[PDB]
Enzyme design. Structure first.
Site, PDB file in Angstrom:
ATOM      1  N   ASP A 178      -0.058  -1.709   8.686  1.00 31.64           N
ATOM      2  CA  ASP A 178       0.753  -0.528   8.927  1.00 31.64           C
ATOM      3  C   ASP A 178       2.035  -0.888   9.654  1.00 31.64           C
ATOM      4  O   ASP A 178       2.117  -1.910  10.332  1.00 31.64           O
ATOM      5  CB  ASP A 178      -0.009   0.494   9.778  1.00 31.64           C
ATOM      6  CG  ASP A 178      -1.247   1.020   9.095  1.00 31.64           C
ATOM      7  OD1 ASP A 178      -1.313   0.972   7.849  1.00 31.64           O
ATOM      8  OD2 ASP A 178      -2.153   1.504   9.808  1.00 31.64           O
ATOM      9  N   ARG A 189     -14.306   5.036   0.846  1.00 36.43           N
ATOM     10  CA  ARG A 189     -13.171   5.083  -0.060  1.00 36.43           C
ATOM     11  C   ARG A 189     -13.585   4.441  -1.378  1.00 36.43           C
ATOM     12  O   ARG A 189     -13.185   3.320  -1.711  1.00 36.43           O
ATOM     13  CB  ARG A 189     -11.981   4.371   0.580  1.00 36.43           C
ATOM     14  CG  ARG A 189     -11.504   5.116   1.821  1.00 36.43           C
ATOM     15  CD  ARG A 189     -10.272   4.519   2.469  1.00 36.43           C
ATOM     16  NE  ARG A 189      -9.828   5.375   3.567  1.00 36.43           N
ATOM     17  CZ  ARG A 189      -8.708   5.196   4.257  1.00 36.43           C
ATOM     18  NH1 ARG A 189      -7.902   4.179   3.971  1.00 36.43           N
ATOM     19  NH2 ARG A 189      -8.389   6.047   5.223  1.00 36.43           N
ATOM     20  N   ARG A 219       0.812  -1.223   0.000  1.00 34.73           N
ATOM     21  CA  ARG A 219       0.000   0.000   0.000  1.00 34.73           C
ATOM     22  C   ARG A 219       0.845   1.274   0.000  1.00 34.73           C
ATOM     23  O   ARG A 219       2.075   1.219  -0.020  1.00 34.73           O
ATOM     24  CB  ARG A 219      -0.877   0.065   1.259  1.00 34.73           C
ATOM     25  CG  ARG A 219      -2.006  -0.941   1.375  1.00 34.73           C
ATOM     26  CD  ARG A 219      -2.939  -0.494   2.493  1.00 34.73           C
ATOM     27  NE  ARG A 219      -3.481   0.832   2.204  1.00 34.73           N
ATOM     28  CZ  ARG A 219      -4.094   1.613   3.085  1.00 34.73           C
ATOM     29  NH1 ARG A 219      -4.254   1.209   4.342  1.00 34.73           N
ATOM     30  NH2 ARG A 219      -4.550   2.800   2.706  1.00 34.73           N
ATOM     31  N   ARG A 242      -4.706  16.115   5.816  1.00 37.02           N
ATOM     32  CA  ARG A 242      -5.738  15.259   6.377  1.00 37.02           C
ATOM     33  C   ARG A 242      -5.788  15.614   7.864  1.00 37.02           C
ATOM     34  O   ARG A 242      -4.743  15.809   8.497  1.00 37.02           O
ATOM     35  CB  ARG A 242      -5.337  13.793   6.202  1.00 37.02           C
ATOM     36  CG  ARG A 242      -6.189  12.793   6.947  1.00 37.02           C
ATOM     37  CD  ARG A 242      -5.723  11.380   6.627  1.00 37.02           C
ATOM     38  NE  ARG A 242      -6.399  10.384   7.452  1.00 37.02           N
ATOM     39  CZ  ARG A 242      -6.337   9.073   7.244  1.00 37.02           C
ATOM     40  NH1 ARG A 242      -5.629   8.588   6.230  1.00 37.02           N
ATOM     41  NH2 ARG A 242      -6.977   8.245   8.059  1.00 37.02           N
ATOM     42  N   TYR A 258      -6.029   5.649  -1.159  1.00 43.07           N
ATOM     43  CA  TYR A 258      -4.904   6.566  -1.330  1.00 43.07           C
ATOM     44  C   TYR A 258      -4.540   6.721  -2.802  1.00 43.07           C
ATOM     45  O   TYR A 258      -4.677   5.781  -3.587  1.00 43.07           O
ATOM     46  CB  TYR A 258      -3.678   6.064  -0.558  1.00 43.07           C
ATOM     47  CG  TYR A 258      -3.748   6.251   0.938  1.00 43.07           C
ATOM     48  CD1 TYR A 258      -4.964   6.172   1.621  1.00 43.07           C
ATOM     49  CD2 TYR A 258      -2.582   6.450   1.680  1.00 43.07           C
ATOM     50  CE1 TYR A 258      -5.015   6.286   3.013  1.00 43.07           C
ATOM     51  CE2 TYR A 258      -2.624   6.563   3.070  1.00 43.07           C
ATOM     52  CZ  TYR A 258      -3.842   6.478   3.725  1.00 43.07           C
ATOM     53  OH  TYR A 258      -3.878   6.579   5.098  1.00 43.07           O
ATOM     54  N   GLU A 315      -1.370  13.253   7.122  1.00 42.90           N
ATOM     55  CA  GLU A 315      -0.983  13.041   5.728  1.00 42.90           C
ATOM     56  C   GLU A 315      -1.255  14.289   4.903  1.00 42.90           C
ATOM     57  O   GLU A 315      -2.407  14.665   4.682  1.00 42.90           O
ATOM     58  CB  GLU A 315      -1.735  11.837   5.179  1.00 42.90           C
ATOM     59  CG  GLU A 315      -1.658  10.664   6.140  1.00 42.90           C
ATOM     60  CD  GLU A 315      -2.406   9.444   5.658  1.00 42.90           C
ATOM     61  OE1 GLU A 315      -3.465   9.605   5.019  1.00 42.90           O
ATOM     62  OE2 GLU A 315      -1.932   8.323   5.944  1.00 42.90           O
TER      63      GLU A 315
END
Ligand code: SIA
Ligand code: CA
Ligand code: CA
Ligand code: CA
Ligand code: CA
Length: 753
Positions: A226, A688, A200, A611, A716, A595
């Site tokens: 993450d 999303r 990602r 963000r 993203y 972000e």
């Protein structure tokens, strides 16, 4: 994927048949390579029969085209007749433009499903070469747009029923005679997967010096998830294209070499393209594999840091990782006297009959009432540091009316400086030195106090100061020594509590203090190289810069990380100014920018979009999931743009997610901004889904409604200008699979108004 025909006399490819196309003629239909003005072309001869070329696609490719969109471009000249049909049909429908010359010789176009016609050219122009473009955008109501020599001719063309299934060009009719010469045919299916989930966090940049070279990045997440998880080992990966993002080379792991025993996770690849050297410099964060930004688990004594790798575009070679952690990761004791005061005092036994010296390495983040003081039982000497209205660094000494301006350049204003006080017993005076430079001498004020003290001293005056070292000495002996730079990096076993190290804490109101920054992270997206800074004091053209995420201890914010020497030495700017409120002597309400992405405006100012995570409401004001900021000093300091938040992007998703912003410059010199983010499904809802594209023709003041680029999952994304007419987009889609979109920006812009 690209399916094309480029006319050439080169034997190996001197016919469409040698370029993958299948001949599909009837009766007298034929074709031949023709030569005119030194430029070969394939002449389709559909007189007394059909003369066309076809290309078959797999069931999977047709499905991809319908799902992500496609584009067909043709460069041809019509010599005579009609039924010149260049189109694409899948096993269900098609968009069919029919080009022809009418009885008067005019070049015209008709569309299956629509009545009437449109005259494209008359006179000699009717039989000259022209560029035709058909663009299909996905969506609930998918439609196509037709362009002639770059100009929009027909929009919202609805697909019509058809059982044909193939890409076709030429004269598609046995009864209608048609002759046309083709220089080039290009059919492109959008959405090719470049990186597969669970990988990602995509970013991308392209070279202007070497047209066609594009470098993309993502996080290789072995185990998924993450950074900071014991169950994963994450690295930075990259792929390069030299043909404009059509074909890509082997996926390359850039950090494996410095992660030999899987002890780390690397994240957030932030690439910057530098035209002066024709290189790509990508920065990224390192984290111990078991602790990172999430949940504030990372601590100052852990291996978080920032590294960069350089790519030489000309020779196509990458260079080994370089560590710049010591330059951008601050280590200090921090006191935020925001809504209160917090001082530390250590009683001493200084002898005023003899010389003494004190040193304090301090950085002023903001505000005033920040001070360092020494009292020797006879006199008290206090230096109060503040930020003035001009943004300069000012010192005020007790008993001295005129303030002293220490620094005016914003970068120097907020950097660490060594404040040294040298008391002379014979002269009965104290001299202030800053970074070894003699500044002033003064007498202080009568006092029976004997101590050294530092911190923010007024609950009514906001201020934040960071300290790296405090020392007091007399007759060759250190009476007090506090090395915060050292302590911040030590493990929990080492005593760091000032109150347990001989100091007394004096606090009022609401304040917070902590050791060094827990972490720094480049953030998701690309960075930029400044080129319009000629009229920006303190800045310079050539500056490399990106908006990084910094975690002091519990709260995230954004700050610029930049280099004025091509990427060898880096510096940090100030964090974004954000509102705060104490719902009482206990509950803190503030924002947490994370972000972010920035772009340089025409006048040199920098526009940043961030963000906003966690709490978004402060003192009754809802700042939304996104907020824009502006910098007028090359990225050193910022200002929050009132009312310029998520609301400026019509139909944007209401859920927090990373976005992308970039400048697009056309050949004529004109320019505008591009922004990508999910729209949600339905548009304007939390989700999303359905990536959208927004445009700003007024330097970020307003944005024109989104053009939907993706129909389905969209998280993203990153967008960058590829050439004078196209932009490339990398976006996370199904199961986070990252796909490439190559958009004709100069054509899409015409669908707005
Ligand atoms: C664009 C298109 O569909 N062309 C098709 C034509 C047209 O339907 C007719 O010429 C009427 O326009 O019919 C064919 O049988 C032909 O003539 O070869 C197949 C061809 O693919
Ligand atoms: Ca490994
Ligand atoms: Ca891990
Ligand atoms: Ca981004
Ligand atoms: Ca937190």
């Amino acid at each position: 994927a690209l399916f094309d025909y480029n006319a050439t006399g080169d034997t190996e490819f001197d016919s469409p048949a040698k370029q993958g196309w299948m001949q599909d003629n009837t009766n007298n239909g034929s074709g031949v390579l023709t030569n005119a003005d030194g430029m070969p072309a394939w002449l389709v001869q559909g007189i007394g029969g059909r003369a066309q070329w076809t290309y078959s696609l797999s069931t999977n490719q047709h499905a991809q085209a319908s799902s992500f969109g496609w584009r067909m471009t043709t460069e041809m000249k019509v010599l005579s007749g009609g039924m010149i049909t260049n189109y694409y049909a899948n096993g269900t429908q098609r968009v069919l433009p029919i080009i022809s010359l009418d009885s008067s010789g005019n070049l015209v176009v008709e569309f299956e499903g629509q009545t009437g016609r449109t005259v494209l050219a008359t006179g000699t122009a009717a039989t000259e070469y022209h560029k035709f473009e058909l663009v299909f955008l996905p969506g609930s109501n998918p439609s196509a747009s037709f362009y002639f020599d770059g100009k929009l001719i027909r929009d919202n063309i609805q697909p019509t029923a058809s059982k044909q299934n193939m890409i076709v060009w030429g004269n598609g009719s046995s009864n209608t005679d048609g002759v046309a010469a083709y220089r080039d045919i290009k059919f492109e299916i959008q959405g090719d997967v470049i990186f597969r989930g669970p990988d990602r966090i995509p970013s991308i940049v392209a070279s202007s010096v070497t047209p066609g070279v594009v470098t993309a990045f993502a996080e290789k997440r072995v185990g998924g998830g993450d950074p900071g998880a014991l169950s994963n080992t994450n690295d930075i990966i990259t792929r390069t294209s030299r043909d404009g993002g059509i074909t890509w080379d082997t996926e390359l792991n850039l950090t494996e070499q410095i992660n030999v025993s899987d002890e780390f996770d690397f994240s957030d690849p932030r690439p910057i393209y530098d035209p002066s050297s024709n290189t790509v410099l990508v920065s990224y964060a390192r984290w111990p594999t078991d602790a990172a930004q999430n949940g504030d688990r990372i601590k100052p004594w852990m291996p978080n840091g920032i590294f960069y790798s350089v790519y030489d575009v000309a020779s196509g070679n990458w260079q080994a990782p370089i560590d710049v952690t010591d330059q951008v990761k601050e280590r200090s004791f921090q006191i935020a006297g925001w809504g209160g005061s917090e001082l530390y005092r250590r009683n001493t036994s200084l002898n005023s009959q003899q010389d003494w010296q004190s040193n304090a390495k301090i950085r002023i983040v903001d505000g005033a009432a920040n001070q360092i003081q020494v009292a020797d039982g006879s006199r008290k000497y206090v230096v109060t540091l503040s930020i003035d209205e001009s943004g300069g660094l000012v010192a005020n000494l007790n008993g001295v009316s005129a303030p002293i301006i220490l620094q005016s350049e914003h970068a120097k204003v907020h950097s660490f400086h060594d404040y040294e006080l040298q008391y002379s017993a014979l002269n009965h005076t104290t001299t202030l030195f800053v970074d070894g430079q003699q500044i002033t001498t003064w007498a202080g004020e009568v006092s029976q106090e004997n101590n050294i003290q530092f911190g923010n001293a007024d609950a009514q005056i906001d201020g934040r100061l960071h300290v790296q070292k405090i020392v007091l000495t007399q007759q060759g002996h250190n009476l007090v020594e506090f090395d915060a730079f050292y302590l911040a990096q030590q493990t929990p076993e080492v005593e760091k509590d000032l109150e347990k190290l001989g100091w007394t804490k004096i606090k009022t109101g609401n304040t917070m203090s902590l050791y060094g920054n827990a972490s720094v992270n480049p953030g998701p997206g690309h960075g930029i190289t400044l080129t319009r800074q000629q009229n920006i004091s303190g800045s310079q053209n050539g500056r490399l810069i990106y908006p990084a995420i910094v975690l002091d201890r519990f709260f995230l914010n954004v700050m610029s990380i930049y280099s004025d020497d091509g990427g060898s030495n880096w510096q940090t700017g100030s964090t974004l100014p954000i509102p705060f409120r104490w719902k009482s002597s206990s509950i803190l309400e503030t924002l947490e920018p994370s972000e972010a992405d920035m772009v340089e405006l025409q006048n040199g100012d920098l526009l940043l979009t961030a963000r906003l995570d966690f709490n978004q409401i402060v003192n009754g004001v809802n700042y939304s999931p996104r907020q824009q900021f502006l910098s007028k000093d090359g990225g050193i300091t910022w200002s929050l743009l009132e009312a310029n938040n998520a609301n400026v992007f019509s139909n944007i998703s209401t859920g927090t997610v990373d976005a992308s912003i970039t400048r697009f410059e056309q050949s004529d010199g004109s320019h505008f901004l591009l922004f990508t983010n999910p729209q949600g499904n339905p548009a304007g809802t939390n989700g999303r889904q359905n990536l959208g594209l927004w445009f700003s023709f007024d330097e970020g003041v307003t944005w024109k409604g989104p053009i939907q680029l993706v129909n389905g999952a969209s998280a993203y994304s990153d967008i960058y200008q590829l050439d004078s007419e196209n932009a490339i987009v990398i976006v996370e889609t199904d199961n986070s699979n990252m796909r490439i979109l190559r958009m004709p920006i100069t054509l899409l812009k015409q669908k707005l108004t």
